[PDB]
Design an enzyme around this catalytic site. Structure first.
Site, PDB file in Angstrom:
ATOM      1  CG  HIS A  61      17.834 -18.309   1.354  1.00  0.00           C
ATOM      2  ND1 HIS A  61      18.826 -18.279   2.170  1.00  0.00           N
ATOM      3  CD2 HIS A  61      18.524 -18.967   0.235  1.00  0.00           C
ATOM      4  CE1 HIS A  61      20.083 -18.329   1.666  1.00  0.00           C
ATOM      5  NE2 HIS A  61      19.862 -18.897   0.499  1.00  0.00           N
ATOM      6  CG  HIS A  91       9.681 -14.984  -1.919  1.00  0.00           C
ATOM      7  ND1 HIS A  91       9.806 -14.604  -3.311  1.00  0.00           N
ATOM      8  CD2 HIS A  91      10.494 -13.956  -1.294  1.00  0.00           C
ATOM      9  CE1 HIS A  91      10.407 -13.655  -3.358  1.00  0.00           C
ATOM     10  NE2 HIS A  91      10.657 -13.290  -2.119  1.00  0.00           N
ATOM     11  CG  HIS A  93      11.263 -11.551   2.749  1.00  0.00           C
ATOM     12  ND1 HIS A  93      12.386 -12.059   2.270  1.00  0.00           N
ATOM     13  CD2 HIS A  93      10.437 -11.624   1.605  1.00  0.00           C
ATOM     14  CE1 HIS A  93      12.566 -11.832   1.231  1.00  0.00           C
ATOM     15  NE2 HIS A  93      11.375 -11.539   0.669  1.00  0.00           N
ATOM     16  CD  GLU A 103      12.635  -8.271   2.243  1.00  0.00           C
ATOM     17  OE1 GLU A 103      12.649  -8.360   0.838  1.00  0.00           O
ATOM     18  OE2 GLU A 103      14.123  -8.695   2.637  1.00  0.00           O
ATOM     19  CG  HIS A 116       8.555 -10.005  -1.907  1.00  0.00           C
ATOM     20  ND1 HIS A 116       9.822 -10.053  -1.185  1.00  0.00           N
ATOM     21  CD2 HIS A 116       8.248  -8.835  -1.319  1.00  0.00           C
ATOM     22  CE1 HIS A 116      10.240  -8.924  -0.604  1.00  0.00           C
ATOM     23  NE2 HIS A 116       9.027  -8.236  -0.729  1.00  0.00           N
ATOM     24  CB  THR A 195      15.127  -7.784  -0.584  1.00  0.00           C
ATOM     25  OG1 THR A 195      14.308  -8.930  -0.820  1.00  0.00           O
ATOM     26  CG2 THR A 195      14.372  -6.471  -1.159  1.00  0.00           C
ATOM     27  CB  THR A 196      17.683 -12.723  -1.235  1.00  0.00           C
ATOM     28  OG1 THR A 196      17.228 -13.024  -2.728  1.00  0.00           O
ATOM     29  CG2 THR A 196      16.443 -12.679  -0.634  1.00  0.00           C
TER      30      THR A 196
HETATM   31  C1  BZU Z   1      16.794 -17.085  -2.381  1.00  0.00           C
HETATM   32  C2  BZU Z   1      17.035 -16.403  -3.709  1.00  0.00           C
HETATM   33  N1  BZU Z   1      15.796 -15.501  -4.063  1.00  0.00           N
HETATM   34  C3  BZU Z   1      15.918 -14.502  -5.269  1.00  0.00           C
HETATM   35  C4  BZU Z   1      15.965 -15.536  -6.469  1.00  0.00           C
HETATM   36  N2  BZU Z   1      15.735 -14.633  -7.605  1.00  0.00           N
HETATM   37  C5  BZU Z   1      16.549 -15.219  -8.606  1.00  0.00           C
HETATM   38  C6  BZU Z   1      17.651 -14.615  -8.523  1.00  0.00           C
HETATM   39  O1  BZU Z   1      18.984 -15.065  -9.510  1.00  0.00           O
HETATM   40  C7  BZU Z   1      18.392 -14.868 -10.928  1.00  0.00           C
HETATM   41  C8  BZU Z   1      19.709 -14.888 -11.704  1.00  0.00           C
HETATM   42  S1  BZU Z   1      14.303 -14.153  -7.751  1.00  0.00           S
HETATM   43  O2  BZU Z   1      14.044 -13.718  -9.038  1.00  0.00           O
HETATM   44  O3  BZU Z   1      13.311 -15.263  -7.736  1.00  0.00           O
HETATM   45  C9  BZU Z   1      14.236 -13.347  -6.223  1.00  0.00           C
HETATM   46  S2  BZU Z   1      12.874 -12.163  -6.192  1.00  0.00           S
HETATM   47  C10 BZU Z   1      13.543 -11.561  -4.642  1.00  0.00           C
HETATM   48  S3  BZU Z   1      12.899 -10.389  -3.823  1.00  0.00           S
HETATM   49  N3  BZU Z   1      12.968 -10.754  -2.209  1.00  0.00           N
HETATM   50  O4  BZU Z   1      13.651  -9.519  -3.934  1.00  0.00           O
HETATM   51  O5  BZU Z   1      11.285 -10.506  -4.277  1.00  0.00           O
HETATM   52  C11 BZU Z   1      14.618 -12.466  -4.324  1.00  0.00           C
HETATM   53  C12 BZU Z   1      14.740 -13.324  -5.349  1.00  0.00           C
HETATM   54 ZN    ZN Z   2      11.138 -11.374  -1.342  1.00  0.00          ZN
END
Ligand code: BZU
Ligand code: ZN
Ligand code: HG
Length: 256
Positions: A61, A91, A93, A103, A116, A195-196
């Site tokens: 992703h 990470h 996007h 985003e 992020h 957002t994912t």
């Molecule tokens: C590819 C999945 N990404 C997810 C993985 N998250 C874990 C989710 O499950 C927990 C039970 S996370 O907390 O690391 C996280 S933060 C963001 S974003 N774009 O909103 O900053 C996406 C994601």
């Molecule tokens: Zn993100």
């Protein structure tokens, strides 16, 4: 399963994660003219001096740099937060073109990418508990514009060769995330979601006003990653961003 392609992109996620249609979904448009300046908002306190990165990973992703979150090493406090939140990973996007990729948008302006830095509220014991809580996570969001090279991003750009496909990881120790921060820590804040998938409504979003610039060469390198695993047909990892969601009775607060 989910992704960003025609067949499994954002428009479909609601079929497996019904919360995609909820009340505080992210990202949103920050309309600068109607955001409320709040003078009760404290400054952010980012203590990233003792952060310990461990590993970079292509997860199909995006690529994530992960940090050791076993002790209060890199923490975010202040701002709209009560309590201390630990950095667990960061990470990005990004888009296939320079005028899209963020985003969050600012007055409908999209940036080339967005960083992020994900944090979880330590009051909840571990990350997996924090994601069951209304205030379980705080993500620091940073816009990136194409311009001059960001020195501290180069180190990440060099390793991307090692993690071109889904499921590859490289060790990535001693990275100082302070090299990704802008000069100003002024921000906008609102309550939202991941957002994912799973699109959980767990997040206080702190979106900094000031962008960092990276060169086209640097963000070019982002675009050469793959969504596919080794030996699968190659699909370039671009446009891994979700579109803006309706704000539905939320007020974006500004620290400035
Ligand atoms: C590819 C999945 N990404 C997810 C993985 N998250 C874990 C989710 O499950 C927990 C039970 S996370 O907390 O690391 C996280 S933060 C963001 S974003 N774009 O909103 O900053 C996406 C994601
Ligand atoms: Zn993100
Ligand atoms: Hg939650």
């Amino acid at each position: 399963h989910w992704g960003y392609g025609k067949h499994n992109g954002p428009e479909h996620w609601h079929k497996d994660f019904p919360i995609a249609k909820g009340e505080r979904q992210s990202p949103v448009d920050i309309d600068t003219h109607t955001a409320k300046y709040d003078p009760s908002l404290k400054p952010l306190s980012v203590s990233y001096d003792q952060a310990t990165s461990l590993r970079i990973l292509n997860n199909g992703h995006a690529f994530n740099v992960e940090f050791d979150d076993s002790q209060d090493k890199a923490v975010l406090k202040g701002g709209p937060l009560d309590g201390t939140y630990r950095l667990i990973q960061f990470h990005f996007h990004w888009g296939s073109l320079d005028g899209q990729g963020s985003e969050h948008t600012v007055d409908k302006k999209k940036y080339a990418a967005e960083l992020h830095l994900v944090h979880w509220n330590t009051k909840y014991g571990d990350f997996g508990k924090a994601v069951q809580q209304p205030d379980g996570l705080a993500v620091l969001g940073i816009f990136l514009k194409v311009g001059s090279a960001k020195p501290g991003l180069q180190k990440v750009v060099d390793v991307l060769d090692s993690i071109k496909t889904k499921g590859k990881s490289a060790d990535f120790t001693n990275f100082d995330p302070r090299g990704l921060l802008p000069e100003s820590l002024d921000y906008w804040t609102y309550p939202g979601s991941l957002t994912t998938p799973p699109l959980l409504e767990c997040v206080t979003w702190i979106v900094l006003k000031e962008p960092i610039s990276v060169s086209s060469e640097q963000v070019l390198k982002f675009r050469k990653l793959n969504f596919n695993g080794e030996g699968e047909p190659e699909e370039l990892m671009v446009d891994n961003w979700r579109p803006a969601q309706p704000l539905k009775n939320r007020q974006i607060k500004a620290s400035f």
